[PDB]
Structure 1
Amino acid sequence: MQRIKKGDKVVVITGKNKGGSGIVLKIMPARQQAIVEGLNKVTRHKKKDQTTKRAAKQSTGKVQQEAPIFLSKLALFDQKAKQQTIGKIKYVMDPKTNKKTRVFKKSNNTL
């Protein structure tokens, strides 16, 4: 399975942004990146191009989007625990459904 999936809450443990909590919107496995909303906001200088029906307007000024972040800098956020902390996860397989599930190793919380 994968450490980070599309949807789970995640934070950053290194870089300029420390303790930045967000939701992963999309995961690129090949480049080992991850787009997390609200973090790594870059502002491309949007030019103007008019060669299509939609390009006839293409209103783009100082649009702030999302920059991808290396998957190593991401860490899963705990929610079930009363005192939330950042830890590592296991890949135990519960015989109830025989499906692999991530479980933290500093607690007993699933996913």
Structure 2
Amino acid sequence: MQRIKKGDKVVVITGKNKGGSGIVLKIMPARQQAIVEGLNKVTRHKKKDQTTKRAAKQSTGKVQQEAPIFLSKLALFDQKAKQQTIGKIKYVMDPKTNKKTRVFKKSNNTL
């Protein structure tokens, strides 16, 4: 399975942004990146191009979007625990459904 999936809450443990909590919107496995909403906001200088029916307007000024972040800098966020903390996960297989599930190693919380 994968350490980080599309949807789970995640934070950053290195860089200028420390303790930045967000939801992963998209994962590129090949480039080992991850788009997390609200984090790594870059503002491309949006030019103007008019060669299509939609390009006739293409209103784009200082649109701030999301820049991808290396998957190593991401860490899963705990929610079930009363005191939330950042830890590592296991890949135990519970015989109830025989499906692999991530479980933290500093607690006993699933996913």
Calculate the TM-score normalised by the size of structure 1. 1.00
Identity within the alignment, %: 100
Q: Give, in angstroms, the shift of residue 71 of structure 1.
A: 0.0
SS at match of 2:34: strand
What is the CA deviation profile of residues 13-70 of structure 1, one whole-angstrom value per residue up to 9, with x for unaligned ones?
0000000000000000000000000000000000000000000000000000000000
CA RMSD of aligned residues (A): 0.1
Structure 1: how far apart are the matches of 2:65 and 2:56?
A: 22
Structure 2: how far apart are the matches of 1:20 and 1:65?
A: 16
SS at match of 2:2: coil
Structure 1: how far apart are the matches of 2:42 and 2:66?
A: 7
List alignment gaps of at least 5 residues for structure 2.
none
Structure 1: how far apart are the matches of 2:8 and 2:108?
A: 17
What is the CA deviation profile of residues 68-103 of structure 1, one whole-angstrom value per residue up to 9, with x for unaligned ones?
000000000000000000000000000000000000
SS at match of 1:2: coil
Aligned residue in 1 for 2:14 = 14
Structure 2: how far apart are the matches of 1:46 and 1:26?
A: 23
Structure 2: how far apart are the matches of 1:43 and 1:50?
A: 21
Structure 1: how far apart are the matches of 2:47 and 2:28?
A: 27
Deviation above 4 Å: which 4+ runs of structure 1? none
Structure 2: how far apart are the matches of 1:56 and 1:65?
A: 22
Calculate the TM-score normalised by the size of structure 2. 1.00
SS at match of 1:27: strand
Structure 1: how far apart are the matches of 2:44 and 2:55?
A: 17
Structure 1: how far apart are the matches of 2:2 and 2:92?
A: 13
